[PDB]
Amino acid sequence: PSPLNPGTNVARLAEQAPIHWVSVAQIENSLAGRPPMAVGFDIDDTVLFSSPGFWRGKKTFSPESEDYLKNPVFWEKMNNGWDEFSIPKEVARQLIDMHVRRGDAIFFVTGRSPTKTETVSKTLADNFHIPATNMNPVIFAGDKPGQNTKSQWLQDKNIRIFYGDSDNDITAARDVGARGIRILRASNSTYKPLPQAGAFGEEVIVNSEY
Amino acid sequence: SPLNPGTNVARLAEQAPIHWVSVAQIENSLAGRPPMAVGFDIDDTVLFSSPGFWRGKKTFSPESEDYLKNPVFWEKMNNGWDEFSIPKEVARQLIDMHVRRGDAIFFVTGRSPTKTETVSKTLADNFHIPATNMNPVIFAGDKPGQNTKSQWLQDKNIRIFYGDSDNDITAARDVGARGIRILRASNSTYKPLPQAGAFGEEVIVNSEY
Amino acid sequence: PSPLNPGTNVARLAEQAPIHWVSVAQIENSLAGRPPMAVGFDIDDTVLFSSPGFWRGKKTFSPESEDYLKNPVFWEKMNNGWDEFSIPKEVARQLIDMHVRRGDAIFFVTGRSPTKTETVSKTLADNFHIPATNMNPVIFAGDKPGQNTKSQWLQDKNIRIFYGDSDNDITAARDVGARGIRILRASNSTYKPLPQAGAFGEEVIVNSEY
Amino acid sequence: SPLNPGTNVARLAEQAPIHWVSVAQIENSLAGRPPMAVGFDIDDTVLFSSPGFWRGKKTFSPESEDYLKNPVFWEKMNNGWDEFSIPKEVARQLIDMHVRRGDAIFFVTGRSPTKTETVSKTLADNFHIPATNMNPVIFAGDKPGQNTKSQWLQDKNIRIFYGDSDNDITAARDVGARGIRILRASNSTYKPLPQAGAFGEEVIVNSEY
Ligand SMILES: Nc1ncnc2c1ncn2[C@@H]1O[C@@H](CO)[C@H](O)[C@@H]1O
Ligand SMILES: Nc1ncnc2c1ncn2[C@@H]1O[C@@H](CO)[C@H](O)[C@@H]1O
Ligand SMILES: Nc1ncnc2c1ncn2[C@@H]1O[C@@H](CO)[C@H](O)[C@@H]1O
Ligand SMILES: Nc1ncnc2c1ncn2[C@@H]1O[C@@H](CO)[C@H](O)[C@@H]1O
Ligand SMILES: [Mg+2]
Ligand SMILES: [Mg+2]
Ligand SMILES: [Mg+2]
Ligand SMILES: [Mg+2]
């Protein structure tokens, strides 16, 4: 593929996709005067670059397949310490700080498989300096027996804004009437392909890959 | 920081004056050249290793950068924490191309030497480096005020050296090798990011991942 | 099966099994003048009453079978923190203190299934106050791929005394010409039936059930 | 502490003057008697619960027994740490026998009350106590110079009370109930062990497990 010297032109150089880009400050401004409310965040590639653990999981539990994601031992390790090697995202630092400034209730809603113990809530509160009153234990959402879905949890907790990188984060928000705001998945994530951020006409946060 | 800073089309089209290259263009520039020794930095060149460096910082020096001079950290980093390091696609392509050429592959890292190391095995395994092309990782260390890599480039007759940092490129310059820059990922915990192209060197496109 | 009122007689009351009972002091006296040597301990029901974790494992993973002992999640949990609920044995405190007095090297050799990480070595060193120079990482012995057997390890480490509660601990010692010394398995252990301590003519430590 | 203390056959045959009984004997003594309320202590009576207490001591007060007055400990102990508690065989036999009689089964524990508790669920589950025979655990607490259980035994009209500690037996004595002692296991972390039989009460044989 690729010609050796493909070149370019200035129309291509300056070309922008029609996406509603926003900054943290602009989101904050859009909420000016609104009292404390509930908001939520996806975890993986939204607030934590957790590919280090998923990568190690792939290699360890299914080097020749994709079954690690349904492997209960993987989930034990991933939810009880491998996030010490996850890299918090600066965009999430700024968003979480902004929502703490607002006095908002902060929820983390994940599609990770649940384990009876998890240290992810502690990692999140500690790394993002989340006070107790704003912090809530991580919600493991899904379809399994005993679970409620992501959208059901958004309704139950009256979450008004949901931040995430995956198309299903945005559509979960859409489905319940919440404001879904997209964060860019880092290009060195092992979760591929990358989503088409902005493809629902949703806001996308600038520079949110790191 | 304005709330609404805006932009303009001069800024949108603006290019820094960088000699961008692709792996294919590098390979083309070597057509007909017989096998040679080539070298690679490790951290943010072939591995996204910030997971272990970040863990190390929190564990060994949460308030300082002392961890980087700490042998207890280096033992961890060099004997298993690279299981969390993520191979870069650019390095897969470069190493495949140079192996296909019959080149000798060397790794010259600023990491400090330890009593044992499993990094050489991690690299040969993950990048599918044939035993004949593979060489044990060279742990050159890092001392303020000196390029600790230059001598090793001389020792191994390395003709092209790939790296993300300024000292990788200037080590190449020092010995008259061809220094080629890889972009450090923006989610690296080694900040600030270097200015790729700062010495007029070639910089590989799309090399952050 | 028993009569409602079985009664007894004084021959039965005074009856003793022909067992070579020893105390920690007697063992120490038997080694007097001998320079530092390697000694080894089994873990379960020898130095730790670990039935709490094994019991939780059985209820959790196989209420109606022994499959929990092959369950990889059980072993992850049992070897990486469930021994916080294991009760150190007083006999092992006294034995380990005695071997540290002698300057002996101390080894723990276990047939627990191996996991990539384990916190058992730390729990043992911490609870039994074992100095660094005497302590050695727990050896997971068995016949899984890559492993060597208990007896092979006693030979490799030149272990001269091996303490344990199970028949296989004593015969491992006998097979390599080491001195195998029996600890009583507590009657509330979930590992049943209880072994016949003394069935090989070996020394059995008094009061060693706790 | 002689190296070689020795023994003699008077010592070998010596018996403490204890009214030992079996579950079968207790059952026989109740034959034909209508359903009644009976009660059990929990700790070292029906559950070997030292795993949670030992974990608590280490977590909350490694130097003292201050953790026993710590409501943060009680929350942990009463809402999941009994997953590590080992049901006693004597209690299986006694509870089965009393359920078979149609008796009401109460648990009166010295543990402190908490906001929530899953101990009742653990007991009904482990001992297969039918819903009709089960009653929610009574958390009587423990205060110096008080028998906190006596009034509960009277309140619930408990006619036989099983327990390992002196307060279990004297609580029965206080209200005219039949107090029956179970042996505390020698590997309990609650020491010293009680003198079973110290009030002339029945003591169940082989009841340490
Ligand atoms: N966090 C994750 N969640 C779901 N799938 C993942 C994750 N990380 C990696 N994978 C998947 O495994 C790989 C299989 O191609 C895909 O790239 C996909 O990313
Ligand atoms: N934050 C950091 N600072 C310095 N070096 C780091 C950092 N993270 C990873 N490294 C790696 O450790 C150093 C060893 O010299 C190399 O510079 C390499 O980039
Ligand atoms: N309850 C139990 N049943 C069977 N084995 C046990 C139990 N508790 C400890 N073990 C033993 O401990 C481990 C160490 O050999 C082995 O799996 C062995 O089974
Ligand atoms: N190891 C223990 N130490 C003290 N109390 C315990 C223990 N295990 C259970 N308990 C219960 O908790 C105490 C609360 O008063 C009672 O003494 C009761 O026995
Ligand atoms: Mg995500
Ligand atoms: Mg580098
Ligand atoms: Mg054993
Ligand atoms: Mg009790």
Binding site as annotated, residues of B: 41, 43, 109-110, 149, 164
Helix axis angle, C72-79 to A72-79, nearest 10°: 30
Question: How many CA atoms within 13 Å lie on the side-chain side of B145?
Answer: 0
Cβ within 8 Å, pair A72-C73: yes
Binding site as annotated, residues of A for substrate: 110-111, 150
Q: Is the peptide bond before A72 cis (omega within 30 degrees of 0)?
A: no
Q: What residues contact residue B143 under an 8 Å CB cut-off, 6+ apart?
A: none
Answer for the pair D178, D146: CB distance below 8 angstroms, yes or no: no
Q: What domains can you pick out in chain A, each with its CATH number?
A: 1-210 (3.40.50.1000)
Question: How many CA atoms within 13 Å lie on the side-chain side of D72?
Answer: 8
Q: Comparing C-alpha atoms, which of B123, B106, B114 is closest to residue B171?
A: B106
Phi, psi of B55 (to 5 degrees): -60, -45
Q: Catalogue the active-site residues of A.
A: 42, 44
Distance from CA of B164 to the nearest CA of A (A): 15
Phi, psi of A117 (to 5 degrees): -120, 150
Answer for the pair D184, D6: CB distance below 8 angstroms, yes or no: no
Kindly calculate the radius of gyration of chain C based on its CA atoms and give it in whole angstroms: 18
> Is position B43 annotated as part of the catalytic site?
yes
Helix axis angle, C72-79 to C51-61, nearest 10°: 150
Longest dimension (CA), chain B: 57
Helix (H, G, I), strand (E, B) or coil at B121: helix
What region, left, alpha or beta, does residue C175 occupy, with left being phi > 0 and alpha being psi -120 to 50 degrees?
alpha
Tokens of D38: 């009976």
Residues C169 and C154: their CA atoms lie apart, in Å, by 11
Answer for the pair A87, B51: CB distance below 8 angstroms, yes or no: yes
Query: How many residue pairs from chains A and C have C-beta atoms closer than 8 A?
Result: 9
Answer for the pair B180, B39: CB distance below 8 angstroms, yes or no: no
Q: ∠ at Cα B34 (B87, B154), nearest 5°?
A: 65
Mutate to test the pocket of ligand 2, among B42, B53, B64, B65 (most ligand atoms within 8 A of CB): B53
Answer for the pair C176, D153: CB distance below 8 angstroms, yes or no: no
In which residue are the tokens 């298993």 written? B80
- Whether chain C has a CB inside 8 Å of the CB on A77: the answer is yes
Answer for the pair C53, C60: CB distance below 8 angstroms, yes or no: no
Handedness of CA A159, A160, A164, A170 (dihedral sign): positive
In which residue are the tokens 């209880």 written? C194
Phi, psi of B144 (to 5 degrees): -55, 135
Cβ within 8 Å, pair C188-D48: yes
Question: How many CA atoms within 13 Å lie on the side-chain side of C66?
Answer: 3
Residues B188 and B198: their CA atoms lie apart, in Å, by 19
Residues A111 and A114: their CA atoms lie apart, in Å, by 8
Answer for the pair B78, B122: CB distance below 8 angstroms, yes or no: no
Q: Comparing C-alpha atoms, which of D79, D126, D98, D92 is closest to residue D39?
A: D98
| Ligand 2 atom nearest to CA at B189 | 1
Question: How many CA atoms within 13 Å lie on the side-chain side of D104?
Answer: 12
Ligand 8 (ion): residues with CB under 5 Å are: D 41, 43-45, 164-165
Concatenate the DSSP letters of all residues of C8-70 into one string: --HHHHH-----EEE-HHHHHHHTTTPPP-EEEE--BTTTEE-HHHHHHHHHHH-TTSSGGGG
Which amino acid, residue A132? A
Residues A41 and A164: their CA atoms lie apart, in Å, by 6
Residues D124 and D112: their CA atoms lie apart, in Å, by 20
Concatenate the DSSP letters of all residues of A109-130 into one string: EE-SPP-SS--HHHHHHHHTT-
Distance from CA of A208 to the nearest CA of B (A): 10
Q: What residues contact residue A105 under an 8 Å CB cut-off, 6+ apart?
A: A36, A37, A38, A39, A134, A136, A157
Concatenate the DSSP letters of all residues of A65-109 into one string: SSGGGG-HHHHHHHHTTGGGGSEE-HHHHHHHHHHHHHT-EEEEE
Overall size of chain B counted in residues: 209
Handedness of CA A27, A29, A32, A36 (dihedral sign): positive
Q: Comparing C-alpha atoms, which of C162, C171, C160 is closest to residue C195?
A: C171
Q: Comparing C-alpha atoms, which of A38, A59, A170, A172 is closest to residue A108?
A: A38
Residues A34 and A30: their CA atoms lie apart, in Å, by 9
Helix axis angle, B119-127 to B89-100, nearest 10°: 80
Helix (H, G, I), strand (E, B) or coil at C104: coil
Concatenate the DSSP letters of all residues of chain D into one string: --SS----HHHHH-----EEE-HHHHHHHTTTPPP-EEEE--BTTTEE-HHHHHHHHHHH-TTSSGGGG-HHHHHHHHTTGGGG-EE-HHHHHHHHHHHHHT-EEEEEESSPP-SS--HHHHHHHHTT--TTTB---EE----TT--SSHHHHHHTTEEEEEESSHHHHHHHHHHT-EEEE-PPPTT-SS-SPP-TTTTS-EEETTTT-
Q: What residues contact residue C65 under an 8 Å CB cut-off, 6+ apart?
A: none
The residue of chain A nearest to residue B90, with distances taken between CA atoms, is: A188
Resolution (angstroms) equals 1.4
Answer for the pair B85, B49: CB distance below 8 angstroms, yes or no: yes
The residue of chain B nearest to residue A90, with distances taken between CA atoms, is: B187
Answer for the pair B67, B58: CB distance below 8 angstroms, yes or no: no
- Whether chain A has a CB inside 8 Å of the CB on B7: the answer is no
Residues C79 and C82: their CA atoms lie apart, in Å, by 7
Kind and range of the H or E element at B53? helix B50-60
Kind and range of the H or E element at B129? none
**CA-to-CA separations, A136 to A124, A128, C94, in angstroms, rounded:** 10, 13, 47
Q: ∠ at Cα C199 (C197, C201), nearest 5°?
A: 105
Q: Specify the pairing of strand D86-87 against strand D47-48.
A: antiparallel
Bridge partners, D47 (sequence order)? D43, D87
Gaps in chain D following residue numbers (C to N > 2.5 A) = none
Q: Could you tell me how far CA C27 lies from the centroid of its own chain?
A: 17
> Is position D43 annotated as part of the catalytic site?
yes
Residues C13 and D12: their CA atoms lie apart, in Å, by 7
Distance from CA of C190 to the nearest CA of A (A): 24
Answer for the pair B40, B207: CB distance below 8 angstroms, yes or no: no
Residues B93 and B95: their CA atoms lie apart, in Å, by 6
